[PDB]
Structures are given as C-alpha cells and as structure tokens.
C-alpha cells in the first residue's frame, strides 16, 4: 500500500532526487528507509532513512554511467512490499 | 480545581491509548505523535495533580474513570454488569470528590 | 510467571509515581528522570505479559493493588492531605472497577 | 544553601563566552537551567536560551567585542534559590 509510486524527478551523473507518495495523513508512516546500491553486487548497498512526513529524498555520491537499484522500505512489511526501481545515470 | 486536572489527565490518557490502538507499532506518524503529545501532557498533568490531592486517591479515581471512560467510548463507535458497575465507582468518586 | 512479570510492571509504576511527587513538576533532575525510567520498566513488563494474561484481569489487579501500594507509600514517604471524608470510596471505586472488568 | 552556585567565566573571546556553575548535590540537580544575557547598559531586551540540567556548562556566541555584558543563570522555578548573575567585558 505505502510507499507508492517511486520515481526519479531529477538526475545528475552523480546524484538522484527521488520521490514517492507517502500515503495520506492517517496512513503516513513514521519513516521510510531508502536503499541504493550498484545494480550488480560487487560491493554491498548503501542505506539511509527519511522521516515519514517527507515524500522526497536526495541520493548523492554516485558513479557516472553506472546503473543503480533503489528501494524504499516502509518501517515494517505490514504496509506492503517495498517498491524498487532501476535507473542509469 | 484539583479534580478537574485529574479528569483532564484521564481524558488525555484515554485519547492516548485509543490513538495507540489506531496507529500501528508507533509507525502511523500522525496518531503516533498524538500518543506522544497525549502522554507527555498527561504525565505533566499527573505530575501536577499529584502534589494537590492525596496520591492514592488520584490513583483510585483514575483507575475508575479510566476503564469507565475507556468502556464509555468503547460503545461509542467501536466494539449488564458494566453499566451498573460504572455507576458504582462513579459513586465511589462522589465520596472522595469535594 | 506471567502474573509475576506483571507484578514487576505494577510495582515499577507504584515506585515511579511516588518519585513523581519528588519530580517537582518534572523540574527536579533525578526524580524527573526517575519516574520516566520506572514507567519505561512498567511498559516493558506489561507488554511482556499481555501475550499471556487477559486484559481486565491484569488491569483490575493493577487497580486494587496500585490503590493499596502507593497509598501506603504515601502514608510513609510523605503523609496525608485528604480533602473529603470516605477512604472506603477508593475501595468501592476499586469495587466498581472490579465489577466492570471481571464482570 | 541555594543553587546554582559559583557562576564563573571559564574561557572568553571577543564574540563568545564559556561559563560554568556549581550544580550542587545530586538532589539539588534540576532538569533545565535557563540562561539570559544582555548588555550592561540596558538599551535592549534580553536574549534567552535554555540548556539541559545535567550539564554545568553553557556556551554563548554572537557577542560584540569590547562591550560589558551581564549574564544570569536561572532555574526552572523560584524555589531552588536566587539566580546567580555576574559581569564580564569582552
Ligand atoms: C506510566 N503510567 C501510566 C499510567 C499511570 C496511572 C496511574 C494510576 N492510575 C490509576 C492510572 C494510570 C501511571 C503511570
């Protein structure tokens, strides 16, 4: 159910500004954890967390041309499966 | 006066526990903040109302109207000895209230 | 043991309330920090027993003993104020509590 | 037999002061000390900021050099003791 609609608004060779639909007031979670790592897997992934009222987040420090996989987890799996997508800088 | 804040702390705790049953594991941000605000207020209310009235009385009174009001608004929209027993403690408050 | 890990939760709250009179409106450090800690302990143990103990049983047990426990701690830690006549009101408040949970 | 005690200026700086105070005994420790600073001449209001009661030190910034100021460390209420106030010229 939440989060819903994970897409990339702006894109730099080294950065990605992502956004999602945080739900709607009474379905606002307290936080979303965002996981971004290389689409391959030669190294582990990176991960941070964003407050639940926020629907957007920035991802800095990426390598140009490399494809990445971004996942936005809810606080728990009860709010639905985590939405994940793919993008190339 | 002192039994106004005690009952105000009763309403606060009741609203907190109900906003807790609405929210999940403190994840639903809006009612999660409600529970924190309701609690932080109610604890600051009990801290101030315990200096006035005897504490074992503010204790007893709270456990009374607590389940009394929690089951009062239970039949409100959500989910016999409970109606008369309500008036029983309610009269018990009437012989420890001003 | 569920009923005994409840007893830790009820006594932690019983201890914490008498410290809240020392908290001085949450303006005195050590009693102010003391009552939030004692209540955190009560939280930890009640939820530990709610997976085994039914609701109103644990609550009315808390009620009667809690009215009893701190009122004797108040008759010793501090003393007595009393602004009305009947002590038995709290026992029949507890009784009114006992007959809307158990009954 | 009051708190806080011994309000002193540890370090100084044209635009910042570092102060401390004797918090007293453990039963004399409070939850939040509020601290007020302003000009000695008194042609302005009084800036105010709080600090948790488990810290006996506080740092102030944004001062104008050369001016004489008056610092006063308060308490949550007026029951713990009279507030200690001192002076210092940056
Ligand atoms: C953490 N905490 C919650 C509620 C109370 C409380 C005390 C006495 N009564 C009767 C009800 C609620 C005390 C502490």
Residue numbers in the entry:
A (entry chain D): 4 to 92
B (entry chain B): 2 to 80, 85 to 103
C (entry chain A): 2 to 104
D (entry chain C): 3 to 92
Task: Quote from the publication.
Proteins from the bacterial small multidrug resistance (SMR) family are proton-coupled exporters of diverse antiseptics and antimicrobials, including polyaromatic cations and quaternary ammonium compounds. Representatives of the ‘Qac’ (quaternary ammonium compound) subtype are proton-coupled exchangers of quaternary ammoniums and other hydrophobic, cationic compounds.
In the two copies of the methyl viologen-bound transporter, the drug is bound in different (but overlapping) positions. For the other substrates (methyl viologen, TPP+, and MeTPP+), this comparison showed that binding site sidechains, especially E14 and W63, adopt different rotamers, thus accommodating the differently sized substrates.
